[PDB]
Design an enzyme around this catalytic site. Sequence first.
Site, PDB file in Angstrom:
ATOM      1  N   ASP A 110      55.901 -33.168 -26.058  1.00 41.43           N
ATOM      2  CA  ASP A 110      56.220 -34.557 -25.767  1.00 41.43           C
ATOM      3  C   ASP A 110      56.481 -35.385 -27.017  1.00 41.43           C
ATOM      4  O   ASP A 110      56.875 -36.550 -26.893  1.00 41.43           O
ATOM      5  CB  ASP A 110      55.084 -35.196 -24.967  1.00 41.43           C
ATOM      6  CG  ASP A 110      55.233 -34.986 -23.475  1.00 41.43           C
ATOM      7  OD1 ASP A 110      56.245 -35.445 -22.907  1.00 41.43           O
ATOM      8  OD2 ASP A 110      54.337 -34.362 -22.869  1.00 41.43           O
ATOM      9  N   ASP A 115      50.746 -35.719 -23.833  1.00 41.61           N
ATOM     10  CA  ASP A 115      49.652 -35.163 -24.618  1.00 41.61           C
ATOM     11  C   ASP A 115      50.078 -34.020 -25.522  1.00 41.61           C
ATOM     12  O   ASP A 115      49.616 -33.940 -26.663  1.00 41.61           O
ATOM     13  CB  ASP A 115      48.533 -34.679 -23.682  1.00 41.61           C
ATOM     14  CG  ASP A 115      48.924 -33.442 -22.896  1.00 41.61           C
ATOM     15  OD1 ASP A 115      50.013 -33.440 -22.285  1.00 41.61           O
ATOM     16  OD2 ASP A 115      48.142 -32.469 -22.890  1.00 41.61           O
ATOM     17  N   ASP A 161      53.912 -36.901 -18.774  1.00 31.75           N
ATOM     18  CA  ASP A 161      53.689 -35.466 -18.734  1.00 31.75           C
ATOM     19  C   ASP A 161      52.792 -35.126 -17.549  1.00 31.75           C
ATOM     20  O   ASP A 161      52.120 -35.988 -16.979  1.00 31.75           O
ATOM     21  CB  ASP A 161      53.053 -34.994 -20.041  1.00 31.75           C
ATOM     22  CG  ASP A 161      53.124 -33.491 -20.220  1.00 31.75           C
ATOM     23  OD1 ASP A 161      53.818 -32.823 -19.427  1.00 31.75           O
ATOM     24  OD2 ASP A 161      52.482 -32.981 -21.161  1.00 31.75           O
TER      25      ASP A 161
END
Length: 913
Positions: free
Chosen positions: A655, A651, A348
């Site tokens: 995700d 995080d 990410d």
Amino acid sequence: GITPEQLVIMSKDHNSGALEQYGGTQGLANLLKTNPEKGISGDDDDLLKRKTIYGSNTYPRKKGKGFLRFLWDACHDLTLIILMVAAVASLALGIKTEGIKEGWYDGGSIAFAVILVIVVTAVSDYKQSLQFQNLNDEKRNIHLEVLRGGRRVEISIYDIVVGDVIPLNIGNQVPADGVLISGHSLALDESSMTGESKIVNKDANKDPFLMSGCKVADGNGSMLVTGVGVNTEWGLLMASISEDNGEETPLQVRLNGVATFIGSIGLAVAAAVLVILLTRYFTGVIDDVVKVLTVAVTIVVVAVPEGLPLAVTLTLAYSMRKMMADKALVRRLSACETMGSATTICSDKTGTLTLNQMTVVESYAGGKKTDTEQLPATITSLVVEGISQNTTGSIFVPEGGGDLEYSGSPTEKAILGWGVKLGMNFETARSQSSILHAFPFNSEKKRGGVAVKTADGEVHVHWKGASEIVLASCRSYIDEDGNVAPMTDDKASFFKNGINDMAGRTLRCVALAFRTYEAEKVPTGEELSKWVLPEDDLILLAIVGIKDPCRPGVKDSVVLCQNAGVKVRMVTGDNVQTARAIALECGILSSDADLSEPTLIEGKSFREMTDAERDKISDKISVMGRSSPNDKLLLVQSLRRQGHVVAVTGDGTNDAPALHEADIGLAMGIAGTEVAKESSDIIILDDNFASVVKVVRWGRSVYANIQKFIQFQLTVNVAALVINVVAAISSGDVPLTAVQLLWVNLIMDTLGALALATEPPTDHLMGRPPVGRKEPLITNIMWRNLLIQAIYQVSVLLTLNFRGISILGLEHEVHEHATRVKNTIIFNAFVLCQAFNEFNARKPDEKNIFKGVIKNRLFMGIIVITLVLQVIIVEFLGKFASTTKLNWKQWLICVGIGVISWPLALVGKFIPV
Ligand SMILES: [Mg+2]
């Protein structure tokens, strides 16, 4: 009826889409029984109806360790299952063979092997699971008033139900999916849910959609809640991750394969021996078939690796403990290895690879960039006073003396961080200056102004605002370490070009200016608001550019990861421009092929393709902007379908599907959301990438240690199988009793596994690319090593088994005593050869440096003393091994037979033969 789950469709539709068909946000009133003054009717049935039809905000919570589940999982080991079947067979067969039916020594060792495996796995995983449960439990939820008729104030977020208007302020967290019914320049930080770094500006007509699990970055307002519980986007994402199955670590499948192969070989050879020997007995009540059957099950027992599960569990537990000595936590033992084999890492952007907090990246001051560094004192004083006296936000604990924590909007937070970096102390900076007038940041008027009465007579007028308008309203500037200087047309062009270039990058543009107009006081004026605060002839101090920067020391970590053969790509919901800039800064995306379609594709383009056509492209996706959580899941699925062992470092809640579907999901310890951490096998408590590199190194070291122990264990098993089979066919007797070798496997594995594990990880492992996911667990080199050692042991122990009474002195004074002595010599020479082969396996594929660690020497001493005690004393220890006392000459013979292992081990290491 009236929005019976059609509202989930409304939220599903595009922003400001399908909301007009229902009459808008106000039209939604009187629907869901919502009144702007009264969010709930006085009665409680009006709340039960909302609880039922539209659900409740409670999300189901997963439960683990319900009833000794981990013991059952350990029992499900395939090699362990082979061990259990062999154990039951041998126990029953022996207890019937002797017929005494007293005690459990015959099968006690084999039962204790699996019992120890189960207990160790259960204890280790229980400790890890409870530790993870304690650590990951974060109270992100903030309890607040629900604002419905001024009734039932301050109820937990789980009590909020659809149809009631709740208030939101700066820093709050949006509890449930909703539409804003009124606000004052409210702006949300959706990076947790959508991955966009910049705060989103919400309007009652333009973008009236607030998402659950969002942080209100700026402004404040009252919002109607629409979706609660599973109906939310947060809830729907948590629902699309629940199902977990069809998982097997590459290490686990490789170990299953090796165990199955060796067990099948053992079963086949033992069956052949049983058939041939039965034919010999019949033609070469009970017909002594029981003795033959106990011999056969003994061969089967020594064939299968009893101590392999013990060694793998011990190695994984030790490496997990060592990783937790670092700042990375592994949820399960298996994961400790799976990250070593990872072939690609999808990371990410917001929260991971970036601090997620806006801060100054570059700046201007005194006619020069002078980014960060340290500004001249003359300009620094004015800049810090302006930053301190022109910001609504403030540092949390300047007076207390603890670590500074900034407040206010991201613009204010970044400006305050810059002021602190310049050496500003908020407590003193605010002092020596009284704010006569303050016109705050305004959407209508971009600039924000203040009048500061310094300790000196003259009063300053500070203006902090958007770069273009501030620059236009100023006609002079403070050059470096000097007094005011008029701004010429060329200088203004230079400043404007700098601002435009700065805006070309992702970073925003905030400019500060100061005007020394004085001789008049705001208090002297009748009304403070009437103070015009003139904006003419300002003097620019420092243009500052604020962006969400790459995490410190992340570029080097990505460089190391790439050097280790592990490609790194970025999957992010942020716009393509921001993702490209951050990737270039963080090293994920090289300069070349920046705009090409395969190198970076948007989420919509990726999802448009069929799952078959999402694989010819998924191998080249280096960046991916505006990718929905389902698009991250699709990317992970495609990468896995192509054979990649995908790791995902994320995080946010978006995700979570990618983390779950990934082979190894890494979640940030502090930045990570509860959903992301729950679905991650490893949670990085460091919130850093160097921890990820260290975890890869630790996984590779774990795999190397497991390979070394596999070599040692296969040597032991294949030497013992040959010895027992040849002895059985030749004479019908087995030199290596079942209990003797069960003890050897148990103790030698449980000690040598951790003895080799003491080898600290070395950077050498990072040089080689990751394992291929298909290469055999036993490399040909390990096969040659174990085969040579096993051949030597077979030779010496068979020549002993057949001619030891004559070869060993004091031949056959008593045939039974001589036979027992010869068997003991064979057994403990086997043990010593195993110990010295463990020595060799400690440092394979090179000349031994013969410099062990303190723990290894201690455990070698432990092995020597336990073996000596077992052989020398026969009471309370050695009864089951059936070992007779040995004289010093015999012990010297055994240690010599063991020592002979080292030279041939070295020769085999240095010779391809
Ligand atoms: Mg994120």
